[PDB]
Structures are given as structure tokens and as C-alpha cells.
Design a protein around this ligand. Structure first.
Ligand SMILES: [Ca+2]
Ligand SMILES: [Ca+2]
Length: 321
């Protein structure tokens, strides 16, 4: 069982509020400017213009914690540089057991709701249970930071808030290592690969890791300094954390091709090359595999041949449990 972060007891607080007919207000991470940031998101920064704090129950009639499952498409980056964290959460959703530990399912905005939620995070050698009240940064009636493709789903926004909490603020989440989040969601350890000097069996390593439920991420190195999140001509993003969400060898024109699937945590802007959603490669793949693997949707997720992946990406991270 997880340790209580800052001694905060989710069940107790929830019961206490539920009994007092009140909603939880987190003293350890209040809906104040400091919780948003200190510099670019500081009290006197224009980026915080119009940002207010509101509970989902104050925005919609029936907000939901989880809708159609807690999946990777529920992770769509907002106005914050926490791609590393979001790619980790999206990868986390693929390991059903760990996902259910980090994200306690069964939390709802209906039965037993008292404006409080909790999440488990592995922090400095131990699993800790972190609580947050459900006040979230909103602007123009929309979540400012992470949001699900589904506007009425809030589990991911709440998880990001809990992660911001352990970091002192949302701004503190700007800039980071996907490896760190992978480990904080698993208690596992990340091994990194320099794709230009990778094992001949790297694809097999990726296959086995995905099957085991390890978390995988990848990125393109940025040596141009300020080309951070620069979109390439083929619509890959540099200095940006991607979730490696799949890998399968497919029967193509009667042959076998090694593909890798990844997801841009933005939830949009996808590779336009071979194997992308509407690419012609799919016309010559087995009708069943095409149906199982290819989804024509601007959801940030797409396939690439392993060769193109090795040619376009510079690093791969595998966090094994
Ligand atoms: Ca969902
Ligand atoms: Ca897609």
C-alpha cells in the first residue's frame, strides 16, 4: 500500500467533506497563482491572462473521470511544455495493471463525490498516494493544460495536476525527461538508446518490451538550440516526447515489413511519410491487418516503418518494470 503524500488521507478527507456537505480544498496545492507558476506562468505573466480555477462540476452538468476507458487519446497537451510527462502517461495507459495503480478507477464526479481525487506515483523509491482537489486551470471555458480528446473526461487533467503538485507548480512541469515520468509511473528503470548506434536486434527488443508492458518513448534531438518543437517537413516534431505505442510486422504486397507505432502527445500533427494514416502503403497490406492496425484519424498516433523510425528519430527510451 502507498504512503500518503504530505500525510494527506484521501478516504478520510473525502468522507469528512462528503459528511460536511462541502467540497475539498487542497491546502498543500491551492487554486492560486503560485500553483500555476513562478515565471512564464508567474503571477504577473501575460500567459496567465484569463486563466481561472474551476472544478469540472462547475463547467459541465455531468463531468466524467473516465470515459470509454483511460486511454492514450485522453492525453492532449495544453499550453505547457510537459510533453515528456504526457508521453509517459499515454504510454502508461498501455500497461493495464500499472495504469490502474497510478489512476485509481472508480473515482467519480457523481456517487461519493466531494471534490477530491487521488493518484499513485512512485516517488524517490516508494509509491505515494497524492491527493488533489478538482479545481483545474481553465481559460475561455476550456482546460488550459492537458485535456482528453473527450471534453467531458478529466482523469488525465487531474493526474497532470497531481504531478504538478509534487513538482510545486504547473510551470515546474515545463521541460523534462520522459524517463523520469516513466519511472514515476512504474518504479521501473529506463534504459536509453542512441538510435544511430543501436543493437541489430533493437526492433525485437521493442517488440518484447511492448508485449511485457514496459513504457516506451522516443524523440528527435535538437541541436539547433531554438528548434524546440519545430515541425519537420514530414510533420514529426523535434525536441518533443513521443510515446512508442506499438510495433507489428505486417504482410505487405505479399511481404513482411516491420512497423512501429507512436503517438504525438499533442494529439495531432502526424508523420506524413510511408505508413502514415492515409498513405498508399496500406492498400497493399492484408485487409485484416489494415483494419486492425490502421486508423484514419488525426489523433497524433501513426505508424512508421522501423527503417524510417531509425532514420528520423534519435533516441528511444524503454522503461522496464
Ligand atoms: Ca477516455
Ligand atoms: Ca493518426
Amino acid at each position: 500500500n502507498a504512503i500518503k503524500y504530505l500525510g494527506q488521507d484521501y478516504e478520510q478527507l473525502r468522507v469528512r467533506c462528503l459528511q460536511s456537505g462541502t467540497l475539498f480544498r487542497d491546502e498543500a496545492f491551492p487554486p492560486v497563482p503560485q500553483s500555476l507558476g513562478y515565471k512564464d506562468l508567474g503571477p504577473n505573466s501575460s500567459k496567465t491572462y484569463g486563466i481561472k480555477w474551476k472544478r469540472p462540476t462547475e463547467l459541465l452538468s455531468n463531468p466524467q473521470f473516465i470515459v470509454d476507458g483511460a486511454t492514450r487519446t485522453d492525453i492532449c497537451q495544453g499550453a505547457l511544455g510537459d510533453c515528456w510527462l504526457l508521453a509517459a502517461i499515454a504510454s502508461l495507459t498501455l500497461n493495464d495493471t500499472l495504469l490502474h495503480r497510478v489512476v485509481p478507477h472508480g473515482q467519480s464526479f457523481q456517487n461519493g463525490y466531494a471534490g477530491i481525487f487521488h493518484f499513485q506515483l512512485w516517488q524517490f523509491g516508494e509509491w505515494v498516494d497524492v491527493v488533489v482537489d478538482d479545481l483545474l486551470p481553465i481559460k475561455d471555458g476550456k482546460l488550459v493544460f492537458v485535456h482528453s480528446a473527450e471534453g467531458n473526461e478529466f482523469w488525465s487533467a487531474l493526474l497532470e495536476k497531481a504531478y504538478a503538485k509534487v513538482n510545486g507548480s504547473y510551470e515546474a512541469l515545463s521541460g523534462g525527461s520522459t524517463s523520469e515520468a516513466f519511472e514515476d509511473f512504474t518504479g521501473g528503470v529506463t534504459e536509453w538508446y542512441e538510435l544511430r548506434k543501436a543493437p541489430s536486434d533493437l526492433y525485437q527488443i521493442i517488440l518484447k518490451a511492448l508485449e511485457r508492458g514496459s513504457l516506451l518513448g522516443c524523440s528527435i534531438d535538437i541541436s539547433s538550440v531554438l528548434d524546440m518543437e519545430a515541425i519537420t517537413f514530414k510533420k514529426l516534431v523535434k525536441g518533443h516526447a513521443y510515446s512508442v505505442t506499438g510495433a507489428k510486422q505486417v504482410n505487405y504486397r505479399g511481404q513482411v515489413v516491420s512497423l512501429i507505432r507512436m503517438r504525438n502527445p499533442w494529439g495531432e500533427v502526424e508523420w506524413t511519410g510511408a505508413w502514415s494514416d492515409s498513405s498508399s502503403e496500406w492498400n497493399n497490406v492484408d485487409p485484416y491487418e489494415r483494419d486492425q492496425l490502421r486508423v484514419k484519424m488525426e489523433d497524433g498516433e501513426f505508424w512508421m516503418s522501423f527503417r524510417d523510425f531509425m532514420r528520423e528519430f534519435t533516441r528511444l527510451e524503454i522503461c522496464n518494470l
